Design a binder for this molecule. Sequence first.
Ligand SMILES: [Cl-]
Ligand SMILES: [Cl-]
Ligand SMILES: [Cl-]
Ligand SMILES: [Cl-]
Lengths: 444, 446, 445, 446
Amino acid sequence: TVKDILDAIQSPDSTPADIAALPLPESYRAITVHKDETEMFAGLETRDKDPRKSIHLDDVPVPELGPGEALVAVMASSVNYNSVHTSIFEPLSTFGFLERYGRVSDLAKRHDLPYHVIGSDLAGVVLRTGPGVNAWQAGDEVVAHCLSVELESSDGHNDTMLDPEQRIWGFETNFGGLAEIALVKSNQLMPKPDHLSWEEAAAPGLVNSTAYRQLVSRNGAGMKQGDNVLIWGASGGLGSYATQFALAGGANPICVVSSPQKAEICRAMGAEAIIDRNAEGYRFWKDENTQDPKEWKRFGKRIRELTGGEDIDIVFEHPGRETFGASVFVTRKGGTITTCASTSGYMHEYDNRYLWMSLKRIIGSHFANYREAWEANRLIAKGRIHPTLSKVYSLEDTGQAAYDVHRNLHQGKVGVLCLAPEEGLGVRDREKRAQHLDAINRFR
Amino acid sequence: SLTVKDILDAIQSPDSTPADIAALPLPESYRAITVHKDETEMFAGLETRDKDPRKSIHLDDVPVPELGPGEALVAVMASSVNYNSVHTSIFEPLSTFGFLERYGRVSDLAKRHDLPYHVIGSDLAGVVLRTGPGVNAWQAGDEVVAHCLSVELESSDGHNDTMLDPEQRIWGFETNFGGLAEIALVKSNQLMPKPDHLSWEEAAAPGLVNSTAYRQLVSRNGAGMKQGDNVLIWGASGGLGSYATQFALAGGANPICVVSSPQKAEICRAMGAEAIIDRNAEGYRFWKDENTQDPKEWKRFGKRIRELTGGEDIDIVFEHPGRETFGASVFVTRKGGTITTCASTSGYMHEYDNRYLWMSLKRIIGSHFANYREAWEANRLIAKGRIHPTLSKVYSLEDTGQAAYDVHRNLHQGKVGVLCLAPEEGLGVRDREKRAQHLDAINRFR
Amino acid sequence: LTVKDILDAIQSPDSTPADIAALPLPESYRAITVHKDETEMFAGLETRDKDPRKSIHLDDVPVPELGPGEALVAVMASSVNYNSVHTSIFEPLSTFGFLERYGRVSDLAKRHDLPYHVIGSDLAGVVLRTGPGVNAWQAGDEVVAHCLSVELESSDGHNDTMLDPEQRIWGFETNFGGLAEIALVKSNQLMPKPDHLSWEEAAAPGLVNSTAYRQLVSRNGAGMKQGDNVLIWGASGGLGSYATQFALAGGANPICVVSSPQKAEICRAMGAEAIIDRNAEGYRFWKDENTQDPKEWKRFGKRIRELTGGEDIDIVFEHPGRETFGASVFVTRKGGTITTCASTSGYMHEYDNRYLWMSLKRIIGSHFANYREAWEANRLIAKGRIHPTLSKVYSLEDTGQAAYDVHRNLHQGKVGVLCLAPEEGLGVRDREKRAQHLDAINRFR
Amino acid sequence: SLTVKDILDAIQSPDSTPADIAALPLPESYRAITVHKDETEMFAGLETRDKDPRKSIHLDDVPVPELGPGEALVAVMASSVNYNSVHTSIFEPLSTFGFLERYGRVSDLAKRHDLPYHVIGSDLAGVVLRTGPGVNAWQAGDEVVAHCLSVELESSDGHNDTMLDPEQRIWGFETNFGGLAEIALVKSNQLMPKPDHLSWEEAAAPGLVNSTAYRQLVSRNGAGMKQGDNVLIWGASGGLGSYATQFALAGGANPICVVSSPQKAEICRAMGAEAIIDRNAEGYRFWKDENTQDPKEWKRFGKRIRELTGGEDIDIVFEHPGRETFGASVFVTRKGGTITTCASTSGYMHEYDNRYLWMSLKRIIGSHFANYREAWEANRLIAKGRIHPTLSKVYSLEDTGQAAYDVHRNLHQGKVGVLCLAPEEGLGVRDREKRAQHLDAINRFR
Ligand SMILES: [Cl-]
Ligand SMILES: [Cl-]
Ligand SMILES: [Cl-]
Ligand SMILES: [Cl-]
């Protein structure tokens, strides 16, 4: 049973030899969305859709292990926006892709199923290794990157994010991490940091690695110490990791939040310059087809007062349409606007005179390649960047967890215990954990 | 005193040397194409396209300005009409006298530009007459072209790429003493060597337009093109497009030329392009509605591109029409590709679908004129005969008003040239063998 | 079922991919080999006098087991590279040491740990069978291969594949090379054959062309601009003969260095005009074994400036190493690049750091190409912008002599080898395009 | 007329406007540290280490130079000793006068610098006295420090990064009127604002060295450091290394400091460095003798690094010792990593194994001083209190000889400072609250 696996992981006296020899259960507990139910939301608006009515907790058969892959006993995961989007079947259900992609080969076909096991983060222990897997073995304490790339095309051989056959694990693949067991490629695997618990270790993955590419990597903004970095939604999932990269890299974050409580979160992170966009009442759109340059100017005036007359070197974009005109306007001459999302709307509108005449640059970014994910996770291992857990749910209550994220109820990360019976487990370096406890817990 | 005629005489006589030009005294006045502070409101309540530059353009006799440190007075043999010269001609968006006036507060030397008249023009080919204090790289008698960037670099901002200087000025636009005249005043760090195999007007043709395309497409500050790239070029036979297309070809890349007519298409074929789209014949309506873009039209355009490339997307979009085409440019670029912009002629409020940008790791790079190193390299490529001037039409100085009109109303393809001091076309070639090597290419736009 | 039986099926249109894959693997295939028994054989001798004709065997060998990610290719043609010659003379040590030790990693790695070594690091041929999880390639596909074998289990190579710590060079650090009737490669080595070229022409560029691409054209190398003055050592050599074409196709200005008038003429045939015959000029950059001559640096720099009209070099395309590196550094422009992929004259470089830091220059190390770089390099061949540079072709049984030829640096450009191909000039699929580029294709012949 | 005391006092009084300070009569002479054209052969036949700067340095009374366009005259409160100041003391490799003579031929203003004496010094902190024509960024009364780069930028070479300008000069070394003096002449594009929380001597300390480290390590023209990098810093408690180490730490990177004593190691620990190698305690001998290197020592060194990093290699090597160390530097750096070099203090004939460079895709990047944007950014980091000055010792102006001697002999860690007009240490701080925050960091080297 799975309980044998849980007890074997927990016990201090267990070997790599031991963990290999335990038999796989016939099925495991999984968070699921169903294919027969994809029409369930019938003429409802998006915000009017409830993940609690579409999410199931099923017993599901263990998948066949292929070459290059790994079966992992999952202690914890988190809720990501992609997970929520899949719950609602928005813009469409995830079964479309799983079906079309399943046609390519028999290995691809494993994913084409009446249910979809979701989740794109994980922290656990490797149970089985596939053939051709050498860097990892059973018993290894791991977290997982969510990029699944095949690399048959040559397009990704100078940055795997350009691979045309890429898949986001647990979104465009089945067997995601919101379950007691998961199937991932071994080149998704990263070592779990010693000083964190399972759910803390699971919390950064997708979001932190995305922030890393966007802001720190040379494929993104390429931040340098001293830069003024404008960070929209600074207390949210993405923003919370971005703010930390800015601070830890010796740059100056200009945190934009929507409340005094969110502002206090950024001050705790260490940010000095904070704009509450709700208190200042910036209306970058007059009506939703006309923008207000006056408001862009007013906002840039506020930034200049906080920086002592400096503009923004790098804007960390993600709200999109509502905000994107201001972002382009406020950036310094020669500076960079970096974007990984458009949550308020994907039809961006900006004045190009401010872009071309001031030699600025808009850089698109999406997730992270494995080297980038490694590096970001490594910075978590070193205690430079910290997990941003605000609330932990049990696997039982992922439905509620997904609703909570859907209505933006919590700051930072929302995490899910999977196999872990209680919070706070899986800490190996008690000394280092104590050195950073205050920071690890800032969101809680 | 010494007239401009005496200077011509001495330029054109066979064995006149650098010694003889240096010895000539400065003339006291010169003929210059001008706009008057008097007349900035003469274009009333009229649409832009109904403003006639010929009403505002004067040919004046103007005094020679004081030659300052780090500067050169040049006898201008030829020049060209640029869009910026046309915008100054009508008074759009505002007249140029506002900036001359404000910048004129900054120093005694800056105040020289603050005049009741504005000598316009941002290109030149001619002969250095006299050199101000501290100028060493140039001397009287040198045959030169000019770049249009003037920088002070008092600020630290432009010390890693000079286009970042906040005190920059476009010569002939945000400075006075421009090149549509018999004499010009420039910084010595605007001067580049005149190509020997070209006549004066041909050497003055590429200037501003060629150096802009270079930075945008070739330079690492822009797109940083590579041989084998597919480069989508909007307006490919127009002034800017005509240089962009040549850079893509000379650099081993594959231009995908967009044009608006079959005669324009033939111009691209003459330059050596094979992948050509007549966007009017195909009837692209990227905007169904003044407020609404049509993604089916983006998709149809991308399909046409892929037929021409054999299934490949655009590595680099060379943008400049702006609002109308910008959504389409973002859509059709390859995953990890670049959209480079230096203008928005159809409208500066760009709208695009950011999903295509972030999800496929695309980049929009803003570009503007060229720093002087980029301008030197661009001009050097003309001197090498890798890239050719694209003159379609040449006017005399007296007829610059007509030239400005011709450009305002988009009458010609390529460049519109102006003879200044030069009494006729085709003068000033020193390397006739290299010229015969490239003559067909040099005359492609005639 | 023989290779002749394999060959006849290939050249038939009805032969389905599932049917070319239905063909049972022959007992054996013919293969160019080095024997572990024999690594000793040249002890005592100067490198110069070691004769690959004495160590190269043509053996009948079995087909290796096919794994995940891999393909078996019926090899119509290959080429001789310096790495194949090195192995054939067992220098600096033999290839067997690595084959053994790396064999320890997995059951699949052990397949290579054999008493013989099938050599060769280029190919052109037809896919015979694909292993588990290969989707982009299938039996019957007409392919060339790049020689980079990467595992990609480490994160190191996921922002540029040349950074993978577990890399091997196919046919040198792997067994089952391309100088043979059948080869085993990863499917991520496969690229489509240029239609307008014959098998041996299509095999010719791989290793060296892709190397030149990365070093000179790629942003991971020098990232050449049109207009750049590019100094190319050994410009009619195998590597130099592709670097020169990239400079020209890319609208740059190669300054070609050659060591003979015949080599100069070949550079003029490619389209180069600025040529320095370093031999006729008698450059002696080293006064003796331990002392450099900066006067000779300067003299060489003056000659460069005579050719460019007073301009220094934007990018030096280095590979001779010790003999030339001091001069390469000296003649580079302020802010310029020296790019290096080899050190044929000796790997201990000595240079004056004053010329490098005070003029803000860069030395950039490059090695082979990642798959995208290689795919792009091969695409430029396919478009007819870059041409193969065969000077000489040998049959499979004469690979010993071919190897000897390259060892002795006898020919210019590339030396090719017909493997399964029964004669020269077969395998062109676009005859009009070939007639367009024929004179260019045959320059080195 | 007025003496220097009278300006010093006039500066200090609060009813002095900029216009007042500017209206102040210049003195007939000012005190300046100098070297004499008379005496360039003084050290003939002596080994470098036996050459004594106290023997060649004079304290002279010197006339104020003519003020030119784009320039400022500065009352210098403090300066510092740099290696280049020391090299000019001992006239190695050749005296400075040669360059000063040759460049004097350029213009009348260039000729100002061509004198029988050379006022030395490439750092300063002080007060703007007088501003030349065209200067708008700065005015009399302004509290300033100086970057040591003077560029003309008449050539195009330097318009995408001014360190490529062929007419560059290092101020105080290739120019006269250096900063070891009571008055200095600089270009206004050398001036940066002085950090409020720092004393004059503290503000003068970073200048040349800090901006060098910045270009080399932080800038995209150098290694382009990121957070998480392993950075090997040779001579970590030295001038250059004292800033390099702070950049690595303040940018979230991991310095591996190489020092030559447990005392030097203690200072690295006070900076915040965790990984420290004492090359003396370990006894690395990278060379067996003068013509043969020892790779066994490279590997041994490599192993020690790997112990401190936990199995990781070096992303970025911060080089400057050169010959002794370069082989090891190239060996220890990670696949795809960078060696960045700005000097070769043990010898400029570098020998390294190219196999490690090409097979592992490594880069050697050369770097030299800083462009003005870089220097501005370096000094801004000091001002924001992210980076601190590393003064260990301070001399008065009359003891500059002794100061150059000490530096020549490598007696001190960090920076050696020099008071010029300041009558005592610790003057000139305006923000005592920021100072209090950073005091222990500021005095770490004392
Ligand atoms: Cl799959
Ligand atoms: Cl002016
Ligand atoms: Cl293998
Ligand atoms: Cl001067």
